Amino acid sequence: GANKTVVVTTILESPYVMMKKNHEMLEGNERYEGYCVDLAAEIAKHCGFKYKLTIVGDGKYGARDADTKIWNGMVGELVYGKADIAIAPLTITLVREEVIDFSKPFMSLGISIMIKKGTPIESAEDLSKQTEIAYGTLDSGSTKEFFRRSKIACFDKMWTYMRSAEPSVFVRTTAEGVARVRKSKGKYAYLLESTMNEYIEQRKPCDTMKVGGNLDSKGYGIATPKGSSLGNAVNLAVLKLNEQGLLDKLKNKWWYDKGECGSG
Amino acid sequence: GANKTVVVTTILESPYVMMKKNHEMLEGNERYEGYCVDLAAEIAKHCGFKYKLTIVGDGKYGARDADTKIWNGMVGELVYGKADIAIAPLTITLVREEVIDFSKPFMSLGISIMIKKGTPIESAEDLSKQTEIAYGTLDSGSTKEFFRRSKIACFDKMWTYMRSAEPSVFVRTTAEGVARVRKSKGKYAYLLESTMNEYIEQRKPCDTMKVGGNLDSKGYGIATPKGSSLGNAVNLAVLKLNEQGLLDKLKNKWWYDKGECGSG
Amino acid sequence: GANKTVVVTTILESPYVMMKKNHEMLEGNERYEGYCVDLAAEIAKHCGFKYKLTIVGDGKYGARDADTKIWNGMVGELVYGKADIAIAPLTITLVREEVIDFSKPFMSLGISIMIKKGTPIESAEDLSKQTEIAYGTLDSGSTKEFFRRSKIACFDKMWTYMRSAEPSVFVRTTAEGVARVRKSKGKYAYLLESTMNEYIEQRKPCDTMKVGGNLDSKGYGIATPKGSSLGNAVNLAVLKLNEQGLLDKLKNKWWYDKGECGSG
Amino acid sequence: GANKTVVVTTILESPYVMMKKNHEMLEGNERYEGYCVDLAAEIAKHCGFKYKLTIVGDGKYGARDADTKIWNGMVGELVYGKADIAIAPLTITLVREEVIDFSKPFMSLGISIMIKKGTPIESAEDLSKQTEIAYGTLDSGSTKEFFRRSKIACFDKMWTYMRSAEPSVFVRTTAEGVARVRKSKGKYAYLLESTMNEYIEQRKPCDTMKVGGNLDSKGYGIATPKGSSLGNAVNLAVLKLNEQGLLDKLKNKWWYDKGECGSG
Ligand SMILES: N[C@@H](Cn1cc(F)c(=O)[nH]c1=O)C(=O)O
Ligand SMILES: N[C@@H](Cn1cc(F)c(=O)[nH]c1=O)C(=O)O
Ligand SMILES: N[C@@H](Cn1cc(F)c(=O)[nH]c1=O)C(=O)O
Ligand SMILES: N[C@@H](Cn1cc(F)c(=O)[nH]c1=O)C(=O)O
Ligand code: NA
């Protein structure tokens, strides 16, 4: 076909994609910064395309409604033909692989526990076995789906609590989960992807931390519509950028090099 | 096509695939045990196939000869049409993805440093900057290729040393690298995949250990010939087994649950 | 035939099927939780069907009226063609096997004695031989039928008392039997299935307990209309879920893991 | 069809079917005694048939050879058309239900641990975590198959040990397992069905006992060839005999009433 600008669906999620502080004065791709903004530029260079970053309209990662069977979020933008690629912290999952394609992972992660510092919790088993400290997840996305589907005893128990907890333990965005941890005086802990957890503990006011091991092991991938020819080049680009050390450099840049909570 | 037994290429590498102690009395797939033997059985169950485990004839993972352009090892078994699938600790790399297909990773790893306990080395930078302690890699495979291609300063320096070191610092198998570490009185350190390193430090005589962080981040995948229809089902099976927690259970079984070097 | 949503008849009985506390806000299968809700989801996954949980309209397990010969309850929903399957604590009995099909048991049980703690009763023989403490059963279902038909001396004696006792010793639901035990100051004991008894002694206020051995040994099965093709797949699914350990995990989840009356 | 004597396949296993002490002087069904001999007589009475008890020629319960796919044992007698019914302690399992029919259970059981008294083992986890005391199973049958197929962590670990243990930990008959426990001075424990374990601890010299809970929960059923019309009547007979209390009376007769190791 003719040359075409690639439509990239992505999501505002720190430090992957963020509005620049002066974004109102800026246009197009220049409005945004972060790990995935940098990654998109490198992928585009290696694959020889021009592109337009487009924040997903509904602010969602992607889930399939049980009733209507409609996908929302970034996954929906791909499935319904709006976007050519998703470059975001989009988790590779079985249900998604059935409907979209993913590159090999550009970053590893697992579900993890964020506490306000001093909360007496060390593990998922600890959380699951006490009744003083509430806990929840992002309200839509792979973390929620993981818990809803899991028959692993501890995680099934956690889901059975979370889905009925009152007031609701689910949040709309990571920033809301973090704020809830920070404001709840040790009485809320947040289950979130380790990559986000590990970012936030590097930010002021340095009052949150990861505790325990991860609950699972997975990866983020660059996604394309199922069968799109673009998937092959993008996958090879991810593998090249990984081997060359660029992914590690970008991770250090956006997570650690300017951390506000010390070193080591 | 007709029903067919799937030919699985694999490699003897502990604890992935090992001869059972009584293997001489046993036949077929029953001769073998380990993480990848267990994984193969689960993949086959989920994908509805019968299979035959076949140890790669040349004992190699897979590399492309610079002159003849011929692939050896497990990669060669796939490329030349001998095997239908590889179920092994086979690293997903760019050069390989161009010629075979890989599932999403079933295990994460990075290149790492093994020392005999007490060796005064803490990092790759340490190794690279001293001249008393020799170091090398497995003689063919992704670790060697990583170093040969790398322009990351420390790793380029290491390769430039290793490729000319005398006597040769390269070994034919992980077990030979481990034996060399154990017998060289602190004067040899071994660069190997973290998964193997972390296994060996759980085995008697408990005289080796991993030191430092990993040098890179990658994954092992289940490989199929390029464009084989079997790749789709096998990938979905890996994702399912991961989500269900089976991969983690197999890792704990073969690495840690019977560790001979303590707990914690 | 065409794809079809399976109609599942079931019954509100803790902890098998319960209304979620926020059920008024919820729709369809999401309204409900418990052991049989979890089991239904697993059976459906293994057998490849979609389903609709439907609480039996008359709140009954199933009995055949002596005069009209009409079946009520869940058994009636199956016999009269309203439901495709019953997934509930439905006891496998001879009279029922003549009119519906059952899977092999998914749970074992026997009739048992519940007392308010401190009641001086240790056995059925004890109950049968004194006249201070009244006792009864659920007013319709397999427990009542067991006593009505039994020629075992102790149980015949008990039935001969219960059927004429004034005020009536029969109750409409397990919760009513439990409340009667709790409110009757040791002057009522309740004969009920051991599985329910063992659940209730794990709940606050921890004032009831099982005493003695069970009076009989039987099982709950997944029921289908007689000769329905669905019975074969559902039976194989029950056997698979049993062997895999899932039934035991669900039992522990709903009976013991969150018990409110201590451990051990 | 014409009237016909039913061929019953069964197995010598105490106290289910045993040779009478004076069996050499006796003919036909009169040679044998035990729980299943008594049960066979009751089933035949209720179903209106004459029958011939026939001890399975190979002394096996039933397993399918991985290579030839041939069934041996009692299962084989049914599958290959030699016997009309199996009346024995034959465990209902998924793989068997695919090829033969089973009544609802006439007895419940689970895999369990037999020790020589004083052996410091309390649980499967204990057995699995030590290396001084060997343990095994009957060499063919549902117990062995359970361990071979299980992905439950503790049981997978146990299987991985047992299948390679030297000398072999497997035995040909329960009596051989019991003798090995008795003669091995606390250095062998035996994994066997709870019903057999509970029988043997009631026999002199009263030097063995069950320890711990059961590892699983299952049942024995009366088996018929798949689709045989005899299955319906036999199932209804089992349910009737259960409800009437006859199964419990037979269990007490053969296990406990003449126990040689005390009461209570
Ligand atoms: N990456 C997830 C979205 N997502 C993000 C998070 F920060 C988190 O904690 N959980 C989650 O599901 C997805 O792709 O759905
Ligand atoms: N996984 C590698 C082979 N392989 C194995 C090792 F144990 C190691 O240290 N290095 C390596 O290259 C490949 O696929 O080539
Ligand atoms: N399971 C029974 C119903 N049912 C329930 C009980 F909790 C009980 O104590 N008795 C009883 O008959 C049936 O299927 O009829
Ligand atoms: N009941 C089993 C046979 N069987 C008997 C035993 F006594 C025992 O311990 N294990 C076992 O498998 C079967 O049907 O295979
Ligand atoms: Na990290």
Ligand code: NA
């Ligand atoms: Na690790």
Ligand code: NA
């Ligand atoms: Na119990």
Ligand code: NA
């Ligand atoms: Na018992």
